[PDB]
Ligand binder design. Structure first.
Ligand SMILES: Nc1ncnc2c1ncn2[C@@H]1O[C@H](COP(=O)(O)OP(=O)(O)OP(=O)(O)O)[C@@H](O)[C@H]1O
Ligand SMILES: [Mg+2]
Length: 254
């Protein structure tokens, strides 16, 4: 079927189908809504070369989660060095930073928060009793994650420390501890990053949902056997747990 080139946020029915169930576009087969289930798969990585739609998809998610949530149930943490998401409102007191030097402590403190939700040792088949957690589902949004140096810090109070270290051990249980993580990066270089970045290698080892926006069919490498294609803005290959790769068009907000 013929996908659109500019998909309006009202052409797809209800955008919010329940907590963590977000319509993000239409699929090529039948133009049916594409529904991101962040409770089932809390991790999403989006790869695309210049101006293909990474940040716009982040904006769409933030706006859709925010419009149908209350501040005492949902919190965002947004890391955005290029500042293209300053526009988008969060909830009160929510961390938005573009400062490469605030990332290390911000992640340490987010990690301490999610870590405190884990169940005690000594349980064994008594936790699958709605153990859950008391408070916010926390959406961690990292635009252009491939542009944050992931090497030990050379200067400042956190010398020798790396930005993503406290996050890694959380990713496997993010769905039980009220954590979602959404990141974006260029298409070129992405396959190598999937192998060398501790953060993105863990995303891939955990089969994170992947959106492959436009990229180079030669250089950008293979993700789960798929090459990038030269696509218009917002057109992506969607890789999930349950279906084979799917062409989709993402909603263009505003
Ligand atoms: N889902 C969409 N549908 C139609 N057009 C889009 C879509 N997403 C992005 N665009 C077009 O591409 C432009 C750039 O989008 P965006 O800033 O999200 O790209 P990016 O991949 O984040 O760019 P950069 O590589 O600079 O970070 C938008 O201004 C719009 O013109
Ligand atoms: Mg961008």
């Amino acid at each position: 079927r013929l996908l659109p080139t500019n998909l309006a946020p009202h052409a797809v029915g209800e955008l919010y189908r329940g907590p963590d169930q977000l319509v993000i576009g239409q699929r090529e087969e039948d133009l049916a809504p594409v529904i991101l289930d962040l409770a089932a798969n809390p991790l999403l990585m989006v790869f695309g070369d210049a101006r293909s739609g990474k940040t716009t998809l982040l904006r769409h998610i933030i706006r859709t989660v925010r419009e149908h949530s209350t501040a005492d149930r949902v919190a965002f943490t947004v890391l955005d060095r290029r500042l293209h998401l300053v526009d988008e409102p969060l909830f009160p007191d929510n961390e938005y930073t573009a400062n490469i030097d605030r990332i290390i402590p911000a992640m340490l403190g987010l990690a301490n928060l999610i870590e405190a939700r884990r169940p005690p040792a000594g349980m064994s088949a008594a936790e699958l009793s709605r153990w859950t957690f008391a408070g916010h589902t926390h959406y961690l949004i990292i635009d252009d994650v491939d542009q944050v140096p992931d090497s030990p810090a050379m200067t400042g109070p956190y010398i020798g420390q790396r930005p993503w270290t406290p996050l890694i051990g959380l990713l496997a249980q993010a769905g039980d501890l009220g954590l979602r993580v959404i990141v974006t990066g260029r298409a070129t270089g992405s396959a190598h990053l999937l192998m060398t970045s501790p953060l993105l290698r863990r995303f891939n080892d955990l089969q994170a949902t992947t959106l492959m926006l436009a990229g180079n069919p030669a250089d950008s490498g293979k993700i789960r056997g798929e090459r990038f294609a030269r696509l218009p803005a917002g057109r992506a290959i969607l890789l999930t747990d349950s279906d084979s790769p799917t062409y989709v068009q993402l909603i263009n907000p505003l």
